[PDB]
Structures are given as structure tokens and as C-alpha cells.
Amino acid sequence: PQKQIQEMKEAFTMIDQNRDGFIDINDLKEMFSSLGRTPDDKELTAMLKEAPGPLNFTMFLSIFSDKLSGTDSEETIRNAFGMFDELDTKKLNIEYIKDLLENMGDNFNKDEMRMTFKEAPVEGGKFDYVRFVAMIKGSGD
Amino acid sequence: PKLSQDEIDDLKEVFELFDFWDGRDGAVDAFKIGDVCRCLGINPRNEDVFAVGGTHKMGEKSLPFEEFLPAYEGLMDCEQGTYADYMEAFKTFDREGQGFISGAELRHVLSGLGERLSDEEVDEIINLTDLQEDLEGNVKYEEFVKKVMTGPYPD
Amino acid sequence: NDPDFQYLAVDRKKMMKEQTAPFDGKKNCWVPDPKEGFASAEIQSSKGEEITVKIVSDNSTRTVKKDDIQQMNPPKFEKLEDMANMTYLNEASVLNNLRGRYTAGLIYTYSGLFCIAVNPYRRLPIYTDSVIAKYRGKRKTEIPPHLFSVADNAYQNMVTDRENQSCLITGESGAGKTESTKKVIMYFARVAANLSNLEDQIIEANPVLEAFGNAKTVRNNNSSRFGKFIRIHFGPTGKIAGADIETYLLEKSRVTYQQSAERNYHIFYQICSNAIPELNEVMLITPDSGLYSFINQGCLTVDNIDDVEEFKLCDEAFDILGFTKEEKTSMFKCTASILHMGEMKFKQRPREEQAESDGTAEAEKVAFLCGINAGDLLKALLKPKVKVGTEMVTKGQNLQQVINSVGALSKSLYDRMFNWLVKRVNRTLDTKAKRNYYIGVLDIAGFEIFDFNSFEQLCINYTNERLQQFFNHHMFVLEQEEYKKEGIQWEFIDFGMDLQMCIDLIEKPMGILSILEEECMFPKADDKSFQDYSYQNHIGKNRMFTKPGKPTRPNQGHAHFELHHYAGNVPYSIAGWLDKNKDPINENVVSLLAVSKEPLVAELFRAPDQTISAVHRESLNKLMCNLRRTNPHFVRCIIPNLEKDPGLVDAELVLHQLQCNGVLEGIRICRKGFPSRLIYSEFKQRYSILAPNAIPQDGKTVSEKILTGLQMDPSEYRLGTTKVFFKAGVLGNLEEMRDERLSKIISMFQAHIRGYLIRKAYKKLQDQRIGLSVIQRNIRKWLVLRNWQWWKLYAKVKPL
Numbered sequence A: 001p002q003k004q005i006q007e008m009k010e011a012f013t014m015i016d017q018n019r020d021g022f023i024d025i026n027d028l029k030e031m032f033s034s035l036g037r038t039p040d041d042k043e044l045t046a047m048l049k050e051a052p053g054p055l056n057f058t059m060f061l062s063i064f065s066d067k068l069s070g071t072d073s074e075e076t077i078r079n080a081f082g083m084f085d086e087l088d089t090k091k092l093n094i095e096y097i098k099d100l101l102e103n104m105g106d107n108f109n110k111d112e113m114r115m116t117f118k119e120a121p122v123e124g125g126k127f128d129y130v131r132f133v134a135m136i137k138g139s140g141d
Numbered sequence B: 001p002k003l004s005q006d007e008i009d010d011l012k013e014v015f016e017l018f019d020f021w022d023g024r025d026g027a028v029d030a031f032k033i034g035d036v037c038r039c040l041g042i043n044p045r046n047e048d049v050f051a052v053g054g055t056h057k058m059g060e061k062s063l064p065f066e067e068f069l070p071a072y073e074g075l076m077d078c079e080q081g082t083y084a085d086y087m088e089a090f091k092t093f094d095r096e097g098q099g100f101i102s103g104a105e106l107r108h109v110l111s112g113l114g115e116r117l118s119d120e121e122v123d124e125i126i127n128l129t130d131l132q133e134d135l136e137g138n139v140k141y142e143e144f145v146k147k148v149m150t151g152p153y154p155d
Numbered sequence C: 001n002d003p004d005f006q007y008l009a010v011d012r013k014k015m016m017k018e019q020t021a022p023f024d025g026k027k028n029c030w031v032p033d034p035k036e037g038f039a040s041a042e043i044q045s046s047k048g049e050e051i052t053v054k055i056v057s058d059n060s061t062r063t064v065k066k067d068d069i070q071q072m073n074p075p076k077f078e079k080l081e082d083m084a085n086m087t088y089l090n091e092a093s094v095l096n097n098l099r100g101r102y103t104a105g106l107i108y109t110y111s112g113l114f115c116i117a118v119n120p121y122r123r124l125p126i127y128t129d130s131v132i133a134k135y136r137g138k139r140k141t142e143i144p145p146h147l148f149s150v151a152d153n154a155y156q157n158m159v160t161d162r163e164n165q166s167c168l169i170t171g172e173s174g175a176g177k178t179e180s181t182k183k184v185i186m187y188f189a190r191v192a193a194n195l196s197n198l199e200d201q202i203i204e205a206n207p208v209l210e211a212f213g214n215a216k217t218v219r220n221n222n223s224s225r226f227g228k229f230i231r232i233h234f235g236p237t238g239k240i241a242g243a244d245i246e247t248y249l250l251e252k253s254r255v256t257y258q259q260s261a262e263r264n265y266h267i268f269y270q271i272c273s274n275a276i277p278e279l280n281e282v283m284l285i286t287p288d289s290g291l292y293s294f295i296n297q298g299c300l301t302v303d304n305i306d307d308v309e310e311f312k313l314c315d316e317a318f319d320i321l322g323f324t325k326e327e328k329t330s331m332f333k334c335t336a337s338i339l340h341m342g343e344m345k346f347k348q349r350p351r352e353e354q355a356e357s358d359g360t361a362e363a364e365k366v367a368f369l370c371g372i373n374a375g376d377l378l379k380a381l382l383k384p385k386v387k388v389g390t391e392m393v394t395k396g397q398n399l400q401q402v403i404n405s406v407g408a409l410s411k412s413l414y415d416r417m418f419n420w421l422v423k424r425v426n427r428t429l430d431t432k433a434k435r436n437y438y439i440g441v442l443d444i445a446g447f448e449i450f451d452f453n454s455f456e457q458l459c460i461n462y463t464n465e466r467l468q469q470f471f472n473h474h475m476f477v478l479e480q481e482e483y484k485k486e487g488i489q490w491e492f493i494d495f496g497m498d499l500q501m502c503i504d505l506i507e508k509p510m511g512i513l514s515i516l517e518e519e520c521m522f523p524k525a526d527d528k529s530f531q532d533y534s535y536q537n538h539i540g541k542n543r544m545f546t547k548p549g550k551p552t553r554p555n556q557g558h559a560h561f562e563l564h565h566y567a568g569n570v571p572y573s574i575a576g577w578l579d580k581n582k583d584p585i586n587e588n589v590v591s592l593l594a595v596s597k598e599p600l601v602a603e604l605f606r607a608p609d610q611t612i613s614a615v616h617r618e619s620l621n622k623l624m625c626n627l628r629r630t631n632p633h634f635v636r637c638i639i640p641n642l643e644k645d646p647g648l649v650d651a652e653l654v655l656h657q658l659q660c661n662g663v664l665e666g667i668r669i670c671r672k673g674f675p676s677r678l679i680y681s682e683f684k685q686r687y688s689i690l691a692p693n694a695i696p697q698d699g700k701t702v703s704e705k706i707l708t709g710l711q712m713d714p715s716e717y718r719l720g721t722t723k724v725f726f727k728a729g730v731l732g733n734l735e736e737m738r739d740e741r742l743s744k745i746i747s748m749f750q751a752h753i754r755g756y757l758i759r760k761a762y763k764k765l766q767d768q769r770i771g772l773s774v775i776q777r778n779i780r781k782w783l784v785l786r787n788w789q790w791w792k793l794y795a796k797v798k799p800l
């Protein structure tokens, strides 16, 4: 990924206050702090441990891309939604999408459901899938 | 009655896709048995599907793929109408004999006789096929009968 | 759209609005019912020969064997004009369709050659001059069933075909055959009138005839007590030219005996009406009917009968006919005298053996009116004078005896008179004018079974027997010439079959009647002497003759032997038959009247150059020769109830008549061939949807293809050159077969449409899966990502 990979180098280096060229317990441990509630023991190792061994960038990337690895673009996800609005109205009916999500495909459960619609942009019974897409990606809020 | 790999494989994909549209879990709802076999090219009737297992409404019984073969096969042995079978039937509603029939009659025949078609099921097929009612208010059943037997994608 | 069609055709559209309950030839049928003859019903379950049903009316449940159930007709056959067209033609279906049209005002219904007429018991606008104009020259099929149509066609048939016609009319008492006859006559008068007149005179003849011919019975208030055959002669331009009448079996016993609530003949109550007092003396009667014993036995009045107006009218009747005052009066005289004969009393010695009168006022009034000597009369009536070879002796009368010779005198006198009356009328109506063809009209009692039956019943039944055989024979020719005419053919016999044996048992050389005849010329013949030979010559030898059986209805009177007529086994009692056949009448008294002074009386008792059964059997063969030389036409009269209420129908009654009527008999007869037929043209249009994959795309061809295609049984049908012949009930099957097949084909086309819909959508479903797949995948990520302690913190290093 273009600016994607490129950026990693930039993040990578911040991800390391010593420059030892690797992210040890400290480097993460002492940036985070430069911000808030430095985690509890359980969290830090849990985190670093996700890595078999020392963080050689190649390991940062592989883990991060390994996580996203399965995502799609904005124009894509919003096109998927657009396959259920044959009219191109830019919105879906709330009950329709709540049923599509909960009883078909790989069914969501009462939890994934609550979590998804808590901050869903829904005016007058119409679920604005265009925004929602910006919300999930980050293009918006 | 007994299939070749070719046939068995297609049923799988179709069964697959339907299993997905009601929760992926290796089971299909007994209510969609009809709709599944229709996608394979057979034209079962509601009494046929009810005679091999099918149900009246969603959520009553689910069938694994291993219970489909028996069902599907059984469904391949029913009677499929032929061009002649249909023409003669419509002919009975045609007075003059010049291959015509009132649009209302057509709609009557489709939702009133036999295992009725829903009014929405009817106005859907008239659109897709494009049954053009002549000035007076009638139509040429010969066409409608070929088109329906010709299929959506027409060769 | 006319009012002239108010009581003639019901509504084609309104009957089409009989859109309530549908019809399943599989579930609807008829079932045996004590109250309604039959009962519509729905089949529910079956267990061999145990069919359980539910009655549409009371929605209850009953069990009936599969053999007693009868087929039901679909709705499109309601109020059918010709019951010969019905898919299922049976007892329950004929009863129902008649009852149907009746409760709807229509009284005329066809059924083959038969024209059924149900008594409306209320005058109707059907026989107006306006109506007549409509039936003129219209075939039967192109117009509502109507008696006017039977008559008119007899007419158009007379001209065109150049042949004698005959219109037989039968049925029970009060069925209305007398009044229908009048209508057939009134119709010709109004269509072939030359241009007082004859037409009139023929109308006037009924009054006088009904005066001595009819009486009030519990069944009819104007029952003709004799059978009458009327022939209307026409000239070379088809105009009425002359006419004549014949009579049969006058009921003589009534003349001196009346059963409760019954009267003697009207004439007696007219001359006793005092409508023409000036005659009271010439007859010598007192204006009181309840005064004389020969007519004061049952009841004396009739509701719809004005004995006074009617006497007036009959008096007028004889004038238009051309009766002289001398004749007319002679009539009233000889009639009046019968009233006094019944008033003659006789004194029986104390303890002995000879009688002597008791007064003369009665015996004198008689001799006066009779133109004879009362002394002579009472001398021969008391102790007679026989006629033994070469030396006539003196016979002694007991008591009784005398009484039996007075009644026998009356009876015998009334008969002679009546016969004279008819012959006179014929004299009038016979305008010595060239006649080319005629049209007769019969009107006798029909076949009737009772609780108790006798010599009088045998006679009637014996006539209709001969008369039914005549019909089966007309049917047989018609059918033959029909089958031959269409190339198919005929394989077999004649419908005058088992009719012959029964008829022979009666009229042939050593049969019933014959023995009665031979057993009468013997003085010491017993009711058992007679029973003895008639057992000897026949019981144990004839099939049509058997012993009494188990009582069919309640109150089955006594009986000596059973007769297998075409309408069932009728139980007869030969008690007294020897007395009912020969008429004992003072050979001495006759000679005295022979020499009477009054022209009539003298003419009534002269000589020529004899007995009952012998008489009738002669007039019957005459009647038949005549009928066998014409083109028949039949009208079957049916009485709806024993209460004269309009619109009321009694099942057991109608069904009974149909059994002896000839309609059921003419169905079983027609069954033997191939009843229902269709013309190739229709067959194809109707049953192409029964074998479409065999049709090329002729007329007889297609048909031969459908039939051979359905593996149709050879016997079941035959192939004519214009239409196709089927056995009875075949087309009913081809009918259900056509219901399931139209049903499935439709279902099948619906099934093709359902598939076309899902096959089209199939592509969207495929795509929409990857799309929902996407959404679920991604929303779950952002639901994961935003909780990954890493990411939640990673994006907190890019706020530079």
C-alpha cells in the first residue's frame, strides 16, 4: 500500500523513543505515558507479546497489515450498501438493514447489533449508509 | 432420478447460496426447497414440494444438504407442462379462436384458478416479459406462453 | 324481453348468478329420503359399501350404501329445457329439475319425446292470442317448452309430411289431462280456422259430455269417468273439416252408489237445481238433491260448482249442437226416471219367499216417463218371464234380487243413454265434408296401483300396457332410423318385448280375461271356480303370473295373484269378477221398453244382429289399429300434491307417477343404445385438452384421435358421420377427466412462471451475497479495530 507503507516508517520511528531501531517494553511504555493511563502489566505484554520476537519493523507491519488484512476501501463498502438501494436514493430503510444484518449472511448477535446502531446516523427511518461509511473508515468522525 | 457429478455439483452451489441467505449453518429452510430446485431448471408445483417435505412458512423446519438429494430427485419426476398443454388450456378461454384473451381474464386465470399466483407475482412477470395489451384491452397468449417458457435470459 | 315469456323461460343471466356454492362432481350427489324423495349431500368418508354423508340442509350425518346413491348434475344444468340433454339422467335428477322449474312458475318441461305438464293450480297468462303468435311455425328447440309447441308441430307435421298425427295424454286423476286436451283443440281452431260454426260446436260438446261423463271425487272436483278419443279432421288447405269422439269404460257402478264425500254425475245435481223450474214437471222432480237415495249418499255440493248455472249452460249446449226440444227433453226424462227407480220400495212377506211392491207413486212416475205400463213393469220386475228354448218359464224373485234388478236397470239405462249421446254429438260434428287427414287426442286414465285392486283396475292397466308397448315401438323405429342414418347401425331387437308376454297372459286364448269370459256362461260358477282354473292354466307356468308377496305399502288390501306389468307387480283380487263382467237385466223388462212409446227409450232397447271385457277388448284393438297408423306425440300429466296447493311438491307422489308414467321407462329404454351424442365440431372444442400431444394442428379425425388416445373402450362409443355416439354416463367421466387436467395444466403454467421469476432474480442474489458479505466483514473490523488497545493508541501518535 502506497502512502500506507511509506507512513509506517514514520509511525515506526515514533513507536521508538530510543531509536534502538526496535520497540521495546520501554519505547512504547514511555510514549504512551507522554499521553495517558499507561496500561496495566497485563496489557503491555499482551500487546508486545503479539510478536513472537523483537520488533523488526517487518514484524510491526506484518501484524498491523495482518489485522486490517481483510478490509476494503470506502468507495467499495459504500458500493456494497448501494446494492440494496436499487433506486440510488443514498439511504436504506432502518428495519431493512437491521434484518439484513441480524438474520442473513453471518448473523450479528444482540451485541454486535447494539454496538453497530448506537451511533448510527438515522434520520426519519432512513439509514444513511454514505455517512456511516465515513464514520467507520475515519474520513469523518 | 439418479444424478451425475455435474448435476450434483450445481445443486451444491445453489443449496450453498440459499443456506447463506438465511444464516450460514449447513441448513436450508424447508420453505425454500421449491425456490432452490427452481434455480436448477425444474418447474415443481406447490403440491409437489409439499409432497417431498416442503413447508408452508419460514422457521418451521430446516434441512441439511444430505436431506436434499432425496427431495431434489423426487422433484425431478413430476410433470412439466408442454407448449401444447398450455396453448389448449388458454384456447378454452378464447371464444372467437383468433388467439386472444382479455387482460382481466389473464389476470383472472393466473390468480384465481389452480394454486393461485399472488397479485404481486403476476404484475412482476407482465413487466419482465412485456405483455403489451392491445388497444381494445386484450392480448396474444401465444407470445406470453413462449416467453414464459423461453426464460429471462432468451438465448 | 317480453311478459309473454314471464312463465316460459327463466333468466339466463340470473341463473348464471347462481354463484353461491361451487360444485364437485366428486362430493355432491343425491340420497334416499323419506320426506323429500331424495336429498342433496356431500360425501365425507368411505368403507367399502358404507358411504357417509352430510345433508346440505340440516348439516346432519347418515349412512347409505354406494348403490343407492345417484349422480348429481352440475349447476349449468338448472331448469333445463329438455331433460334429455342432462349429463346424468336419473330419478333424482328428473325429480329435481321438474320441481325446480315448477317452484319457478314454469309448468312445461321436455324429456325426449315427452312433454311433461305439472298442474299449476292457478290460471296463467301462457295461453293468450299474443303468445300463440309466437309459437306459430317454430320448431320445439327454438322456443320455451310449451304444449302449444307439441300441438303446432303435430300440425306442421300433418301438412308437410302428409300423414296422420296423434297426441296421447295420460297421468293420474286431477293431473290435468282433460284441461290440456281442451287447450290443444283451442290452438288449432285458432291457427287453421276456415274463415254456429264447427269450431264452436266442438267446444259445446264438452258441457253435455261433462254433464253425464264427469263427477265429484276426492281427487278431482270434475273428474271425467270415461276415456275419450277425439279425432279432428282437416281439409286439403289444412283447415278444420270435421271431428268425432269415441268413449271407453264408463263407470256405471257410480250411477246408483256414491262413496262418502263423492257425488254421482253432475247431470243429476243440475236437473235437481231448479234452474229451469218449467221442466220440474216434465221430469216430475222436486228441486232437492238430498231427497233421492241414488244421489244422496255421499255429499251434495261442490265448491267451484254452481249446479244451477251449469244446468242452464248445458241446456244451451244442446241448442248450439242442434238438439230438438223433443230429444233434449227425452234426455232429462230418461235421466229423471233413474231418480225414481231408486225410490221404489218393496215389501217382503213375513217369513217367506217372494216379494211385492209397497206403493206405486215411484213405479208409476217411472213407467210414465219410460212410456210403458207400471203394472207391466212391476209385474216383470217382481216375478219375471224368462226365455228358455221353445217354452219360456216363470222366474221367482226374492227380495234383494228385485233391488239388484232396479239398480241394474238404472246402470244399464244410463250407459245406453250416454252411448246414444256421444253418437248424436258425432252426428252434429260430422259435416259431410271431404277430410284428408286427422289428428286424434287420447285421454284415458293412466296406469294406477292402489292398496286394493280389482277387475276395474285390471282393465285400465291392461289398456295402458298395450298403450305403452305402442310407445316403445315408436321409440324403437326412431332410434333405428337414427343409428342407420349416421352410418353406425343397429344390432338388436325391439322394445315391445316383455310387454307382449304380460299382454298375452291377459288377452290371448287361454289367458285371464279369456277364462273370465268362459267362466261366466256357467250358472254355478264360484269366485273359487274362477280362481281354480286361473291357477290351473297359469300359476306355476307363467313368469308374469305369481303368488301374493310381502306387502309393499301399509294397508295393502287382500289379493289372489300378482301381475308383472311394465310398471311393477300389481296385486289383484278376483272377488266378484263374475258379477262385474256380465250385466243381469230382466229379459222381460227389456222387451217392454223395446216396445216403449217414447222414441228414445224404444231406440235404447232394440236389437241388432254383448259382454264387458269383450266390448273393451274390441274397442281397444280398434283404437290401436288407428294409432299405429299415425305419427305420435306424448304429454305426461303429473299432479304435484293431494291438496290442490300451487307450488307445493310431494316427492313420493311425483316419483311414483314417473315410475308408471313412462318417462323412467323411456330412459331405461334409451339406455340400451348410445343416449348422449355430440357433433364432432363440439367434441374437439370440448375435449382437446384431454390429449393435446396427439393433435396435429379435421373434425371427426381429431375426435377419433382423442378417443383412441384415451384408450377409450370400443363399446362405450360409436362414430357417426356427423356426430359421435356415447353410452350413458361416459361423457360424465370425460367431464371429470377434463376438470383435473385443466386444473393441473394451469397449476403447471403457474409453476413455470414461478421458476422464471427465481431464475431471473438468481443473479442479484449472487451479487448481493458478496455485498452483504462485505458489509458484515467490515463493520466487524471497525468494531474490532476501535477496541484494539494497539490501534486505539496508534492513531494517538499521528496528531503531529
Ligand SMILES: Nc1ncnc2c1ncn2[C@@H]1O[C@H](COP(=O)(O)OP(=O)(O)O)[C@@H](O)[C@H]1O
Pocket (backbone or CB within 6 Å): C119, C120, C121, C122, C123, C124, C171, C172, C173, C174, C175, C176, C177, C178, C179, C180, C220, C221, C222, C223, C224, C637
Ligand atoms: N292447465 C291448467 N290450468 C289451471 N288449472 C288446471 C290445469 N290443469 C289442471 N288443472 C286443475 O285440475 C283439475 C282438472 O283435472 P282433469 O279433470 O283436467 O285431471 P285429469 O284429466 O287427471 O282427471 C281442475 O279442477 C283444475 O283446477
Ligand SMILES: [Ca+2]
Pocket (backbone or CB within 6 Å): B018, B019, B020, B022, B023, B024, B025, B026, B027, B028, B029
Ligand atoms: Ca440456514
Ligand SMILES: [Mg+2]
Pocket (backbone or CB within 6 Å): A016, A017, A018, A019, A020, A021, A022, A023, A024, A027
Ligand atoms: Mg526501542
Ligand SMILES: [Mg+2]
Pocket (backbone or CB within 6 Å): C174, C177, C178, C222, C223, C224
Ligand atoms: Mg279427467
